Design an enzyme around this catalytic site. Structure first.
Site, mmCIF file in Angstrom:
data_model
loop_
_atom_site.group_PDB
_atom_site.id
_atom_site.type_symbol
_atom_site.label_atom_id
_atom_site.label_comp_id
_atom_site.label_asym_id
_atom_site.label_seq_id
_atom_site.Cartn_x
_atom_site.Cartn_y
_atom_site.Cartn_z
ATOM 1 N N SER A 49 -22.878 35.204 -51.396
ATOM 2 C CA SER A 49 -21.435 35.032 -51.745
ATOM 3 C C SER A 49 -21.234 36.249 -52.595
ATOM 4 C CB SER A 49 -21.362 33.798 -52.430
ATOM 5 O OG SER A 49 -22.192 33.780 -53.560
ATOM 6 N N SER A 56 -26.068 38.438 -50.678
ATOM 7 C CA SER A 56 -27.463 38.061 -50.878
ATOM 8 C C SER A 56 -28.304 37.887 -49.287
ATOM 9 C CB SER A 56 -27.737 36.868 -51.474
ATOM 10 O OG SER A 56 -27.197 37.067 -53.030
HETATM 11 C C1 LIG Z 1 -25.833 36.671 -53.113
HETATM 12 O O1 LIG Z 1 -25.041 36.770 -52.247
HETATM 13 C C2 LIG Z 1 -25.867 36.773 -54.752
HETATM 14 N N1 LIG Z 1 -24.149 36.936 -55.179
HETATM 15 C C3 LIG Z 1 -24.153 37.696 -56.172
HETATM 16 O O2 LIG Z 1 -24.843 38.161 -56.853
HETATM 17 C C4 LIG Z 1 -22.570 37.947 -56.455
HETATM 18 N N2 LIG Z 1 -21.853 37.213 -56.977
HETATM 19 O O3 LIG Z 1 -22.340 36.200 -57.818
HETATM 20 C C5 LIG Z 1 -21.427 35.343 -58.734
HETATM 21 C C6 LIG Z 1 -22.498 34.223 -59.348
HETATM 22 C C7 LIG Z 1 -20.499 34.772 -57.967
HETATM 23 C C8 LIG Z 1 -20.936 36.381 -59.801
HETATM 24 O O4 LIG Z 1 -19.750 36.600 -59.616
HETATM 25 O O5 LIG Z 1 -21.760 36.813 -60.767
HETATM 26 C C9 LIG Z 1 -21.930 39.163 -55.534
HETATM 27 C C10 LIG Z 1 -20.782 39.663 -56.017
HETATM 28 S S1 LIG Z 1 -20.271 41.086 -54.917
HETATM 29 C C11 LIG Z 1 -22.013 40.843 -54.270
HETATM 30 N N3 LIG Z 1 -22.557 41.783 -53.396
HETATM 31 N N4 LIG Z 1 -22.742 39.847 -54.872
HETATM 32 C C12 LIG Z 1 -26.401 35.444 -55.056
HETATM 33 N N5 LIG Z 1 -26.206 34.429 -54.224
HETATM 34 C C13 LIG Z 1 -25.519 33.483 -54.014
HETATM 35 C C14 LIG Z 1 -25.786 32.801 -52.621
HETATM 36 O O6 LIG Z 1 -24.704 32.437 -51.956
HETATM 37 O O7 LIG Z 1 -26.827 32.561 -52.133
HETATM 38 C C15 LIG Z 1 -24.604 32.910 -55.056
HETATM 39 C C16 LIG Z 1 -24.286 31.508 -54.919
HETATM 40 C C17 LIG Z 1 -24.309 33.767 -56.069
HETATM 41 S S2 LIG Z 1 -25.601 34.784 -56.658
#
Ligand SMILES: *C(=O)[C@@H](NC(=O)/C(=N\OC(C)(C)C(=O)O)c1csc(N)n1)[C@@H]1N=C(C(=O)O)C(=C)CS1
Length: 260
Positions: A210, A43
């Protein structure tokens, strides 16, 4: 350097792969750790998308007020703000704040659509001199952060230099750069990441990320009191696809950097 030895030790203790880039704008010095290796942005690429829409607003002066419909088909894996507005609209300002401060992925997808697709985000990066950034995909219900995958990656050095140009530099217009700084300062998702390793007298604006493989990222602009600002990028990813988040590693990286 002393900082690189401690960051190498942090990485070794962590079981993962750490990338750090610090720019001290007092004298343009940099500290890099794996600064030229590619990491999944997750993100943290939302800053580029928001900045690219802000850049459009330098010509379309009321663009941030433009309403965007939120439809059920727009919802993806994580959309805490946009979900509150299904069957209504949000302005591009509201979508940008949601994307940046609550890491809303539907909001990010609307920013990308406003730019004409992920190639519009990448193009903005190229236009401000970032040759490394590449955004390839919108957010979907199944996102990835796969080791070796070049899609949606950047390097710590490139992201720090871009973040510097967008916030401290003048890659954006005057009101736009101030708006981006306000949004980053108001982020709500970073309390356990870079912010947790820094002296509390320092003002921070940050964007977290993340993802899979325990990918845990944060990029920050930092304003110490009575001292030129810093840009700090901390990227971290792990060998196991289902690894847990490690926001503590980013906090520890920032603490190591701040000591130096
Ligand atoms: C940004 O990093 C976003 N991340 C995601 O959408 C991803 N996984 O989100 C979770 C909620 C963990 C899921 O498993 O559905 C993801 C997986 S691989 C990838 N490229 N992205 C959002 N940002 C955050 C942040 O750290 O700001 C989050 C807490 C998760 S949503």
């Amino acid at each position: 350097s002393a900082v690189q030895q401690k960051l190498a030790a942090l990485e070794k203790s962590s079981g993962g792969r750490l990338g750090v880039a610090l720019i001290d704008t007092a004298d343009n010095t940099q500290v890099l750790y794996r600064g030229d290796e590619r990491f999944p942005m997750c993100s943290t690429s939302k800053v580029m998308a928001a900045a690219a829409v802000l850049k459009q607003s330098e010509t379309q002066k009321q663009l941030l007020n433009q309403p965007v419909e939120i439809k059920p088909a727009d919802l993806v894996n994580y959309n805490p703000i946009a979900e509150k507005h299904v069957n209504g609209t949000m302005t591009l300002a509201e979508l940008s704040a949601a994307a940046l401060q609550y890491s809303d992925n539907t909001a990010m997808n609307k920013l990308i659509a406003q730019l004409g697709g992920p190639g519009g985000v990448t193009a903005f990066a190229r236009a401000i001199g970032d040759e490394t950034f590449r955004l390839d995909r919108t957010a979907s219900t199944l996102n990835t952060a796969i080791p070796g995958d070049p899609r949606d990656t950047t390097t710590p050095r490139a992201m720090a230099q871009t973040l510097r140009q967008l916030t401290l530099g003048h890659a954006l217009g005057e009101t736009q750069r101030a708006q981006l700084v306000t949004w980053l300062k108001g982020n709500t998702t970073g309390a356990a990441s870079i912010r947790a390793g820094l002296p509390t007298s320092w003002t921070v604006g940050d964007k977290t990320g993340s993802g899979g493989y325990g990918t845990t990222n944060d990029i920050a602009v930092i304003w110490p009191q009575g001292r030129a600002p810093l840009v700090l990028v901390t990227y971290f990813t792990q060998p196991q696809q289902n690894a847990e988040s490690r926001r503590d590693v980013l906090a520890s990286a920032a603490r190591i950097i701040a000591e130096g």
